[PDB]
Design a protein around this ligand. Structure first.
Ligand SMILES: Nc1ncnc2c1ncn2[C@@H]1O[C@H](COP(=O)(O)OP(=O)(O)OP(=O)(O)O)[C@@H](O)[C@H]1O
Ligand SMILES: Nc1ncnc2c1ncn2[C@@H]1O[C@H](COP(=O)(O)OP(=O)(O)OP(=O)(O)O)[C@@H](O)[C@H]1O
Ligand SMILES: Nc1ncnc2c1ncn2[C@@H]1O[C@H](COP(=O)(O)OP(=O)(O)OP(=O)(O)O)[C@@H](O)[C@H]1O
Ligand SMILES: Nc1ncnc2c1ncn2[C@@H]1O[C@H](COP(=O)(O)OP(=O)(O)OP(=O)(O)O)[C@@H](O)[C@H]1O
Ligand SMILES: Nc1ncnc2c1ncn2[C@@H]1O[C@H](COP(=O)(O)OP(=O)(O)OP(=O)(O)O)[C@@H](O)[C@H]1O
Lengths: 362, 362, 362, 362, 362
DNA sequence: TTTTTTTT
């Protein structure tokens, strides 16, 4: 009896899988008895346990096929085709709206009954992040709209401050929230072409840790990056399309994505200073160090790195109207959860503790 | 029954699509019952909502096919094949006439009942552009004549001026108008081999901000561009066919397109200067800057970059006799719509406002 | 019923096509009723309207087929096979005789009843070329013999002088006449290898403006050209076979064709000097400059650089016995047409006009 | 009603054709009625007229097939396979015995009833050749045996010095005689590692004007040639197998053929120089130029570069005992014809003219 | 009826053929009747005449097949798989035991029914091999222990001493008995890092003459050798797995095999010598060069290079118990064939002919 | 499988 290629493709769509080998392996597992499946019973992975029951029948026939890799190819093509349709047609607002739906799906599992994540510890993260910069929550909302509107010239933000001052931590959480990529531009100029190649179809980019020239008088090690950026004006201003390259692959032409730049106190040419919308100073604050020293579970679980943490901050601080209308229904349910889960006083006690440099919890 | 490969080919032809994945993803959207299609109801994409109902039945059968990518590859071949047939058999004038028809179709949508753009905002951009150079519309017609005739060794125009004097802005508009590609010649002198490969079958090309060398009193970063261009005199001259290459492709051969070179005020080896028909000196101007600062919607919607803006200028300024005969019919209708919309006094008000450096609209 | 692959192959033989996409594109056009076919009614392209009625019945079936690119590939390889058989078995004289029939056929169209070209404008071109050098028509007869005899280490002519001397123009016309290829050697020493692969099965080749070294003493930037050719002596000599790459293909092995090298004046190693059988120096002549400046349809139609103009020059000047015996009938016909179409006095006055730098015509 | 792939393969064997396009082109000629075949009637090519009638019926059925290239690919592979099997099984003396039978069969045609050339002219060539250096036939007989006995690190003779010494002239004739290959050392060593792959299954090889270093006293431009000679010294010595590259097929390892190499009088180290046997740089004899100047049909017909000239010279001079036994029949058969044509006084008269700078005949 | 794919696969295992072209070619020969197969009748090639009669029926049907190359590809895969299994499963001991069995089978063939070799020739070869230093049969055998044992550190000896000493000739000869390869060492380690990877998967390895840094100052031309291996702490030592590259490949890495190094009488820093268990000076000693000046067959038929000569030096001097335990049966029988034909005294005449430079054969 | 890349 015949295999349904359709049922495979539906699984690939719903897992959003795009690796042929990864798709193949997981479908083959469904061939074993669903009714006894140990992986189902232990509820180990949703991509398995949500689906084994449905696909078991087809997986048995799949296991006898001789066309196995061919079936998977057509399935994975369908997922890649969907992405390319989306990329060429969605509004940037709708792109973001999808991305939040994915994070909210993950949170539903994480804080579920089988979920590992301690909603209390993750809210300790938000308390710490909200201390990192004044008006933190508004700053995020401003950055977000800036990426969505993507207005020419008004496109790029500068993070400035000493080593161990948090700028990478915040950048990483934003990049997770938005699904960009990091880039390094300190290379010899000829090398840049495949670096910039990374940007293709990305929503954000982060230029990490740009080195200037001079300031080794202040022990800042010198390098190319500042001068390279001054030479890339059209990519920053983002008014016109540019050509981007990948290894073995034809060039593609597109608007260069908006993004973030991070540095120590190198001297910045006035040319570059005109490019940035906002400069944010990061400074080491001694009380945060002593707090982290007493609340290491933040680092151990990588809480303060995560876009998941920033999304919780937005849900706590921003009005429901500020989110894209379609997801507001989920937002209200999460607001309701958090309102039930914490009094404002217990949350505010954490902020006070962080200001004491004391461990977050008491 | 069975898939009609013919219907898929027709869809590819009508959408003028030449990505196999985009075609695949697009066609798959039609598999759902037409009568409920929210994309149709929301009138989001004409390349969807025109076609769903017609293609529906075959899209459902296609969804079951075991052969899907083969069908799409054949369809994309016919679209690519038509481009090559046209490249060899059309006159350069006919090409331009076709390109204009496409832009005019986009203009029918933009300013159509879907109401999706403001014809007044777009007309403001023409005022700002008609300021950017003396006799601006005459310069466009001369450039168009130059590009249609394609006189050998009289094929290239040189743009120079300081930074911030609009030259890439003007190049971008001409490039969207004609169709073509930009190129970067400041590369290492080997990968030029693949860089120049982008010129294949194009109509224009633009070489962007070619770096000269030395004279650093000019405060100009040095690079390969000028000396490297002087090693490519042949490609400018366009007197004989040349050989062109892409990744994994064996060489095409054809005449290298006509086009534009842009640079800062470096000094030119006159052997290359001998290959430029005409040279245009851009100046920074204050009232442009002040007007533009008070007219930001121009930039926020990329109006002054966009080929539609130049086409609107020609329609306003030029006699109907100057257009190729078949589109004179559409040109007349657009002229009527413009004169209906705008008095000459309104246009003169706008131009005076640009000259006054106030926000254009008053 | 089924597609005839044989009929497709026959059309490819008839058209002497080579791009599988060009073949595919053009054959698809026949699917519409030739009865109505607008292109036929315009009589626009002979490659179409001579064949549409014949191929229509089979094109309708081809339009449905699932194999289309496969059918086309077989036909293209049939044409390529024919070329290889010809290349291995014709005398060089017969090859040229075939090539001349192709030009004569086009000329029968050029000045046919459809008569898109004016024979008087085209004859004006011949006068300008005959003026360009001493004994021009004798020089052309010499060059043809040299290329046909293909005597080893007596195979290459060097053109040199200043810029705008016309050397490229003359090369371009000779190249068109014999149907060679043009090659660049001012290039990366590695990728020369795929570059030279173009010359497989070609009758003739031309190297363009081969850059010398130490040239900038004379205002000429130095380059790879001479530095490359001094290696390739065996390719010039044509005394022994050499082996030729193509991308994704194993090497051919054959004698490298005879040809021409152009340069602006540079120092030549005496080793390389020994391998050019003839030297020609070209000089600017301001009366020619003024004449083209008036008679600019010469440039716009590219008349002065067509091999058709050289063929016409030979027809006017050379005895019929100098032509290969087969074509002598068509030669007598065209001689008679031309002697009828122009007096000697007309041609004499054209020369005086050109000599006097006035526009050619009065 | 079906193609005999066997009959196709027999033609490929009997022609010893080993190019798939060449065979394809060849066989398709047979589809027309051999009855009318102008090539047959003309006795145009033996590869045609011997075979047309035999293969006609099969060729008509082949002309309709849809597998045409696949059929030819299998046929070509049997030819390459046969070469490989002979290549390892046969004695080096046995190889030459086959090669000579090939050339003799050609001479049968050249001087046949078709008689397209005449032994008169060719013997004048022999006179010019045997004149060129002392005792020429003997030193050829030596070089032959050297290549049969193939002593390791003793496999190579060299010629050096003046341009137009004739060293290429001598080399080319030897290569046409043996059926070796020629290769170029002067490319980047990496490219050589692929290029040397052509040496597969060759009795003999040569390399021409390999660019050494120094010799600037003689204005010789230095290069990578000797660098890569100094590299490949195992290939030179043939004391061991080494690997040989191909595209789309495995590289194969075997011992390397013997040969000749030639250069201008560059430097090259004695870690080479000592190896070689019986090297002769030889230098001009001007009166030969003057005979040549008067006997130019030699060069036009490439006679003094044809290996057929050498074979005629050996037939003329050498005892019948000097040759392998089977061919001694045909040796005598030809040696009769030389006597039957020529008195000694003919050859004597020729060598007077040659010695005395007049054209060979009087 | 149909081709047995199985029978074709047997012949590949039988002949150990592993080239698809050779397999195809030889198998096609069997299509004629073995019954009067003249190759069989002449007994020329066992790889033919041993098999023809069995395979004939299958070969006839094979010659009629249309899939022929596909059949052969599978058969060659079989032999390749068979090899790759053994390469992973077996000990160096077992591997070397098989290798002796093969070379002893070549010994059997050489001195076989044909008498194609006369062992006295190889006694003279062995007598020459004996000359170099005392008991060197044992010292070879003891090195071969070091090779099989591959005990860490205890892996490497150094062949010091000048040109033509045979030291590379002998090191190469072991590659017949054992496989392996030699490599250069005289760039800075910088480049040699791209060259070390040819040591991968080698049974054993060899290294060419270590130059001293600036060694021209020591009258031995320069190259950066010693300071490279002064500092490659581990590579010759070989406890744990090393890291390596073949230029433009990847770091598949494992143990660095044991091997030989040589030098042309250069100097040695301590950490270079620490790489070896031994260092020995090799010279082209006076009577030895004189005996080669007087003894020729030992070079002419490559005896001095062949592994067969090394095997016989061991059979002539190593006692049976030292050999591969089952092969010792054959070792006795060859020892018998030695003693059957030579006393040690007649062999001592040869030793003394070498020892006093007079020609060996006597 | 090459090609492109990588090296350069
Ligand atoms: N504002 C801060 N005050 C004190 N300590 C900080 C602060 N921000 C970060 N930290 C400490 O610095 C460590 C590294 O943080 P982070 O990577 O964000 O710093 P950074 O300045 O962006 O570094 P880099 O420039 O190296 O990428 C954190 O794990 C934490 O221990
Ligand atoms: N003539 C002008 N005078 C003043 N400001 C100008 C002028 N033209 C452009 N601008 C401003 O400069 C910005 C950049 O324009 P554009 O990028 O085309 O110029 P450019 O710097 O000269 O270009 P290029 O990249 O070719 O060197 C515009 O978006 C506008 O804000
Ligand atoms: N002898 C001449 N006298 C004056 N003008 C000339 C002459 N020959 C050519 N021209 C002008 O020079 C233009 C370029 O000619 P052409 O490209 O053949 O010259 P070239 O010497 O080969 O140049 P380059 O070195 O730039 O390739 C022609 O189109 C014509 O306008
Ligand atoms: N003995 C000779 N005297 C004069 N000219 C000679 C003599 N031998 C050969 N030549 C000339 O040398 C020309 C080229 O021959 P060939 O290519 O064999 O020489 P070559 O020394 O190998 O040259 P190169 O080093 O330039 O390749 C011949 O066409 C002939 O005219
Ligand atoms: N002891 C010897 N004396 C003289 N000649 C010898 C001796 N041994 C071998 N030969 C001959 O010299 C040739 C070269 O020997 P080989 O290359 O092995 O010496 P080498 O000392 O390793 O030299 P190099 O240091 O130059 O590589 C041998 O193949 C053989 O023909």
């Amino acid at each position: 009896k015949q295999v349904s290629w359709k049922l495979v493709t539906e699984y690939a769509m719903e897992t959003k899988c795009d690796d042929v080998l990864l798709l193949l392996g997981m479908y083959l597992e469904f061939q074993y008895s669903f009714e006894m499946c140990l992986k189902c019973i232990k509820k180990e992975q949703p991509s398995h346990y949500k689906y084994h029951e449905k696909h078991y029948a087809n997986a048995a026939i799949f296991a006898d096929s001789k066309n196995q890799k061919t079936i998977c190819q057509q399935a994975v093509d369908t997922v890649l085709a969907k992405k390319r349709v989306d990329s060429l047609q969605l509004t940037r607002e709708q792109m973001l709206t999808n991305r939040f739906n994915d994070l909210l799906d993950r949170m539903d599992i994480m804080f579920g009954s089988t979920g590992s994540a301690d909603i209390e510890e993750w809210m300790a993260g938000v308390a710490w992040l909200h201390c990192l910069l004044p008006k933190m929550d508004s700053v995020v909302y401003d950055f977000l709209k800036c990426m969505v509107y993507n207005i020419p010239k008004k496109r790029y933000w500068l993070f400035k401050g000493p080593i161990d001052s948090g700028k990478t931590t915040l950048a990483a959480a934003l990049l997770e929230l938005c699904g960009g990529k990091a880039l390094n531009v300190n290379l010899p100029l000829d090398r840049l072409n495949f670096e910039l190649g990374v940007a293709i179809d990305q929503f954000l980019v982060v230029f990490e840790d740009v080195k200037g020239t001079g300031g080794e008088s202040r022990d800042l090690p010198s390098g190319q990056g500042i001068n390279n950026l001054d030479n890339l004006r059209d990519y920053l201003d983002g008014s016109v399309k540019v050509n981007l390259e990948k290894k073995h692959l034809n060039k593609r032409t597109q608007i260069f994505p908006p993004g973030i730049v991070t540095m120590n106190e190198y001297s910045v040419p006035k040319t570059l200073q005109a490019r940035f919308v906002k400069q944010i100073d990061f400074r080491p604050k001694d009380y945060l160090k002593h707090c982290l020293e007493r609340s290491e579970f933040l680092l151990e679980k990588r809480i303060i790195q995560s876009g998941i943490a920033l999304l919780l901050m937005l849900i706590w601080y921003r009005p429901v109207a500020e989110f894209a209308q379609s997801i507001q229904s989920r937002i209200v349910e999460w607001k309701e959860r958090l309102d039930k889960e914490f009094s404002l006083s217990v949350y505010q006690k954490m902020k006070f503790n962080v200001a004491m440099g004391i461990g977050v919890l008491d």
